[PDB]
Design a binder for this molecule. Structure first.
Ligand SMILES: NC(=O)C1=CN([C@@H]2O[C@H](COP(=O)(O)OP(=O)(O)OC[C@H]3O[C@@H](n4cnc5c(N)ncnc54)[C@H](OP(=O)(O)O)[C@@H]3O)[C@@H](O)[C@H]2O)C=CC1
Ligand SMILES: NC(=O)C1=CN([C@@H]2O[C@H](COP(=O)(O)OP(=O)(O)OC[C@H]3O[C@@H](n4cnc5c(N)ncnc54)[C@H](OP(=O)(O)O)[C@@H]3O)[C@@H](O)[C@H]2O)C=CC1
Ligand SMILES: CN1C(=O)/C(=C\c2ccc(=O)[nH]c2)NC1=S
Lengths: 386, 390
């Protein structure tokens, strides 16, 4: 009577998102889906309690089971250490996981037809994917950067700058071909999965050789694994330059992968091998909202990013398992969310995008529990019907 | 009769901006201001003709007279060489001038109330300083990339491994920065904050590049304490280093009204600020507007935006005034800046602004004036505004 989801690593979070997260599982996921769930408590007091072990433990779990969905979690500073009496200034969980998993991060804003987009439109969303020794130079003299190949066949030495002025500062950066390659695979697969064109954008004219190598190693992997599958879906890859991008793009239908309100932005880390994926929101814990919540005040916090974390995650578990039932479900919910907002029912943040904050009458939007309630109602219906 | 302006270095540019600059002069400056005008014609023909000499001179002039106003100039490339049979693909004027005067470039966007902004929280303006010359090359296969510092005083050289490539090849690059260059950045930066009475913010990835951005933060504080804290507190402003992630946070959540030191185009104003805090060069941040200019050539109606260009004149003129204690000029410059904003805030604008409000597809002709009409309306409100302050 319920769907078999399968293996999902979930990660609990902090403050206001910890609440929405629970609200989602309760009203939107568990009433409908059975999962073999590898839950990991990543909330600040638990991370401290276990010496950030829970984090490493979770990351390994995702590596194992391919699918991870993550609630937003407190990264620590002074005030935090002071607040929870933390033993240490724990390294961002995103950082720790990203480190054990690799891959490249894709960021997509969810588009609602009644919600202002920067460009008037933009019917379909653009999907953005983003991609050293430094020292002091006491006084004058040459800083040269020099390359000797393994076989000692040559030696190239380029001068970085000659200091006759005084001292300064200097640095050296590198980048292996492998990493560029992983960036490419991920970039093309992303374009495949979402059946959309891919673009690349570089300096290329300034940092010629560096950004050149990117142009190249993309082309090559395209022309030897992807030129084929791509046109098998009437969909291209192409290069371009940053300002010529923003050119034909800020006058575009939108809806392509481009390689280089917060409640609506969705990040996803897509690993090299295409099989492993972690989804989360792009926003934080929404502390301001949670302080209010604590104070007994009413809140209007956008659960969409967090929802899409779930769906995109579930979507990818379905894909892997070859699970048409589940696949349908994830999609069905992604629909209901956009549907419900387009229907006019929405949280305060969205309402502000439409009317501007000074203009928002309480009856223009719904509070956190009201909006979550409404999606619950609309999901229940939409599923009952089709 | 007219206000005595003083020494001002004028540079004339190309294409649409050339047409507009002549209108700004004719209609808005000259009628009210006499000026000891060192003009230099930075047209492309003339730059060609004189063997980019006129450029150099203009820079040298600005050096000597402290105040410049630049019209947008063509930067050549292959296509341009053909169009103009150029003797040579001459370097970017700004490039030439900036490498003679030094200092720090500063963009401020001009904000009208009726113009959908980037963030509606930004009710007051945000001014951004930016600091290029990095050597980069391709590792074809395995080997070591090392970066070596040999002191000029004969002390043992110092070698850092940048990466030892075993599995494959890749890319590499050195980057550098002189103390002088950073000192300059800091000064220019504190100069401009005091100038504009707004507070100053430096951002870095200092945590991540301990030594490289470490130097900046330091050099900035060390300069800030040694000679600006006094003047800063004695004006209710402050300096402060921050990290980029904190810095965009506070920015996106702010009221605007601050200068930030960082390591629509007809409303963007570029200002080169020399460290001495005595020389300034003003210019619109946009280019020569060929697209519009070729429309103008073929007899068609244009609606190009003069504000950017006008503010070149006004910061230049304003700085001149401030230098010379010219209370009369000072007023005028402001008076004109306001009239600008005002006129647009009154509905009278160019097509590009009209499309900021009504959406590019929904822009009807009656929403906006064309270049020449709008330029007149500026002329009209200026006269009127000026007549009122008397
Ligand atoms: N683990 C993770 O993935 C991340 C964690 N964080 C953590 O978040 C904590 C504090 O977050 P902070 O950086 O202050 O800001 P957040 O990114 O948490 O959100 C700050 C502001 O953005 C708006 N906002 C963001 N998300 C939503 C939403 N879903 N619905 C409605 N409004 C939203 C609200 O604006 P308004 O005030 O106008 O209502 C909110 O006050 C920090 O401790 C940080 O470490 C941050 C980012 C990612
Ligand atoms: N000397 C200088 O400081 C600079 C010079 N240039 C030079 O300009 C030439 C061509 O410039 P280009 O690349 O077209 O860049 P431009 O800055 O001239 O502008 C390109 C587009 O931006 C919009 N735009 C810019 N300024 C205005 C304005 N004042 N009013 C209305 N719309 C505006 C127009 O778009 P739309 O067509 O949609 O109206 C315009 O076609 C080159 O040779 C280049 O080197 C460029 C930048 C700076
Ligand atoms: C405005 N502008 C430039 O500055 C430019 C190139 C440049 C500038 C300074 C320098 O030191 N080297 C190169 N081209 C255009 S247009």
């Amino acid at each position: 009577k319920k769907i078999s989801g399968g293996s999902v690593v979930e990660m609990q979070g902090d403050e206001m998102t910890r609440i929405i997260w629970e609200l989602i599982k309760e009203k939107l996921i568990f009433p409908y889906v059975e999962l073999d769930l590898h839950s990991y408590d990543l909330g600040i007091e638990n991370r401290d309690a276990t010496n950030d072990q829970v984090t490493k433990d979770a990351a390994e779990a995702i590596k194992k089971h391919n699918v991870g969905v993550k609630c937003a979690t407190i990264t620590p500073d002074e005030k935090r250490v002071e607040e929870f009496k933390l033993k240490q200034m724990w390294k961002s969980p995103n950082g720790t996981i990203r480190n054990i998993l690799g891959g490249t991060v894709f960021r997509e804003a969810i588009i609602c037809k009644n919600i202002p987009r920067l460009v008037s439109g933009w019917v379909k969303p653009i999907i953005i994917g983003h991609h050293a020794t430094d020292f002091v130079v006491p006084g004058p003299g040459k800083v040269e950067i020099t390359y000797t190949p393994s076989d000692g066949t040559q030696k190239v030495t380029y001068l970085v700058h000659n200091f006759e002025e005084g001292g300064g500062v200097a640095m050296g950066m590198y980048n292996q071909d492998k990493s560029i390659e992983d960036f490419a695979h991920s970039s093309f697969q992303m374009a495949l999965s979402k059946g959309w064109p891919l673009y690349l954008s570089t300096k290329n004219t300034i940092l010629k050789k560096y950004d050149g190598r990117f142009k190249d190693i993309f082309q090559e992997i395209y022309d030897k694994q992807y030129k084929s599958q791509f046109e098998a879906q009437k969909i291209w890859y192409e290069h371009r330059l940053i300002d010529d991008m923003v050119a034909q793009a800020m006058k575009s239908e939108g809806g392509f992968i481009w390689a280089c309100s917060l409640g609506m932005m969705t990040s996803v880390l897509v690993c090299p091998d295409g099989k492993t994926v972690e989804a989360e929101a792009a926003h934080g814990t929404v502390t301001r909202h949670y302080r209010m919540y604590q104070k007994g005040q009413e809140t209007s916090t956008n659960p969409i990013a967090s929802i899409f974390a779930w769906t995109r995650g579930l979507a990818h578990r379905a894909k892997l398992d070859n699970n048409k039932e589940l696949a349908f479900f994830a999609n069905a919910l992604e629909e209901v969310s956009i549907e419900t907002i387009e229907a006019g029912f929405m949280t305060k943040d969205l309402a502000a995008c439409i009317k501007g904050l000074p203009n928002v009458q309480r009856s223009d939007y719904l509070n956190t529990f009201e909006f979550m309630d409404k999606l619950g109602e609309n999901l229940k219906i939409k599923l009952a019907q089709a």
